[PDB]
Design a protein around this ligand. Structure first.
Ligand SMILES: Cc1cc2nc3c(=O)[nH]c(=O)nc-3n(C[C@H](O)[C@H](O)[C@H](O)COP(=O)(O)OP(=O)(O)OC[C@H]3O[C@@H](n4cnc5c(N)ncnc54)[C@H](O)[C@@H]3O)c2cc1C
Ligand SMILES: COc1ccc(CNc2nc3cc(C(F)(F)F)ccc3nc2C(=O)O)cc1
Length: 448
């Protein structure tokens, strides 16, 4: 049942709302007609694909134009265990795909912090995960994709070939090269749905960095950390590092050998429920509390399912998610940014720390080799201007912001952060001269 309706659309950050016509149809031919309709106007105010709206900013909204909800196109066409390939519509989400692929011994090669993201969304933001340093981003694993272009045609793209340029423009392209309808993804072979994990707790930022620089990182396919962004030096940047690899069946305890590829993360066992009024006691902030934490977070060869290894903040004024990457070599500059954040008087509790590996050939891809950080700032006075200063520091240190998180950065800052934007822009103008594809972000970041 195809429907088009005016909808107030915000990203996950629940900010910068705009009203657009949301076309929601499970018919692929209907989607082609809409694009053909918009392109007939010679552009109009454009259209933009929307997945599960998990992006924090304004890349999946188009104020005064068209938004096409891709989530109804959620057919898994095929999964092959021999070729490791999945042929799926763009609307299928990674949780669905993970659940469907496990009985084949196939693993989603790149998984984000949440599993409620579409294949289209995964490609369009070139998403990264705990395994980036060893697997790359989501783009690295796409063997083909079908792109609906401005001309109303469906172009079949491959990473290497005669349409390679448009392929890598679409990777990290934020839906601005057209609409991904269908994609073939190569999966990661696995014999279990489990991880072999090693945990380490560090005392400071220096120690967290030394751990990631000592070579141990090459021993783990998956690696991420939670760090302290509020405590003053030297406690600043202390981390609970979580590193590991996917497990083989023999590495499992005998009671788990029966169902190696079974998934079992789910319980009503949530800590707010068991403990309504907190984890803290009289030891928590003293030397015993720090001892407890150090020993608890330090372990070797622990068998963990998906949620315990991979999936372990509320306020009235909303939050500001802020993610950036500083080049590997610029270590001192990275420490300086962290120092600035803790001295800001803006307090972040959920802090993701990860060292990214080698980057791909997508000119708009976010990840570069270096120190990746996500911080959550409660919205309060002076935040916007503070993060503009961070923007300046990130840019100055060869770093960039991530489109999947941004809602407020300027076009100038962004263009300087992405030195290959002119090249990307040139591909976009070839494939969409009329600006048939448009979004709030495109207009804000001057990518239109
Ligand atoms: C709790 C949480 C944790 C997260 N963790 C991570 C993480 O660890 N790593 C990471 O990289 N990201 C992470 N993200 C961000 C997320 O991976 C991206 O925002 C992703 O794009 C969301 O996919 P979506 O289906 O919601 O797409 P949407 O948010 O709906 O759309 C985002 C962009 O994708 C485009 N798009 C969507 N569908 C299509 C299509 N069919 N064809 C063409 N373009 C399309 C849109 O035009 C838009 O520009 C996280 C987000 C949340 C809320
Ligand atoms: C309140 O519940 C929670 C708890 C933890 C998370 C972690 N989410 C995230 N994990 C991330 C993990 C990475 C990593 F680890 F580097 F791959 C990168 C970005 C990430 N971004 C996010 C995000 O929030 O956008 C999200 C919600």
């Amino acid at each position: 049942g195809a429907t088009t309706t005016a909808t107030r659309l915000t990203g996950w950050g629940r900010t910068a709302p705009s009203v657009a016509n949301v076309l929601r149809t499970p018919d692929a031919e209907m989607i082609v007609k809409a694009v053909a309709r918009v392109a007939e106007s010679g552009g109009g105010r454009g259209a933009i694909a929307r997945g599960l709206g998990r992006s924090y900013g304004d890349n999946a909204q188009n104020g005064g134009g068209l938004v096409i909800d891709m989530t109804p196109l959620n057919t898994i066409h095929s999964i092959d265990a021999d070729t490791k390939l999945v042929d799926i519509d763009a609307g299928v989400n990674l949780d669905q795909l993970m659940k469907a692929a496990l009985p084949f011994g196939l693993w989603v090669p790149v998984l984000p912090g949440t599993r409620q993201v579409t294949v289209g969304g995964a490609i369009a933001c070139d998403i990264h995960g705990k395994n980036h340093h060893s697997a790359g981003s989501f783009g690295n694993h796409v063997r083909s994709m079908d792109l609906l272009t401005a001309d109303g045609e469906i172009r079949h793209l491959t990473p290497t070939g005669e349409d390679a340029e448009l392929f890598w423009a679409t990777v990290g392209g934020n839906g601005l090269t057209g609409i991904i309808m269908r994609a073939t993804i190569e999966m990661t072979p696995t014999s279990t749905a489990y991880f072999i994990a090693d945990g380490d707790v560090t005392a400071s930022l220096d120690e967290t960095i030394a751990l990631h620089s000592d070579g141990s990182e090459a021993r783990y396919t998956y690696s991420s950390a939670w760090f302290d962004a509020i405590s003053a030096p030297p406690k600043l940047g202390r981390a609970a590092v979580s590193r590991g690899r996917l497990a083989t069946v023999e590495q499992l305890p005998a009671k788990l050998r029966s169902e190696p590829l079974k998934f079992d993360a789910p319980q009503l066992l949530t800590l707010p429920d068991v403990f309504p009024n907190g984890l803290a006691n009289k030891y928590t902030f003293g030397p015993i509390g720090e001892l407890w934490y150090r020993k608890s977070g330090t372990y070797r060869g622990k068998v963990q399912n998906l949620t315990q290894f991979y999936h372990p903040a509320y306020g009235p004024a909303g939050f500001l998610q802020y993610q950036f990457v500083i080049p590997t070599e610029a270590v001192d500059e990275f420490k300086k940014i962290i120092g600035v954040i803790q001295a800001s008087g803006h307090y972040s509790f959920l802090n993701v720390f990860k060292l990214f590996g080698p980057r791909n050939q997508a000119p708009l891809s976010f990840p570069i080799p270096g120190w990746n950080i996500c911080v959550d700032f409660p919205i309060k006075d002076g935040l916007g201007k503070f993060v503009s200063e961070l923007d300046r520091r990130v840019l100055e240190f060869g770093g960039r912001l991530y489109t999947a998180k941004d809602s407020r950065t300027t076009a100038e800052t962004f263009h300087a952060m992405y030195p290959r934007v002119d090249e990307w822009i040139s591909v976009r103008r070839k494939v969409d001269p009329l600006r048939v594809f448009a979004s709030d972000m495109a207009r804000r970041l001057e990518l239109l």
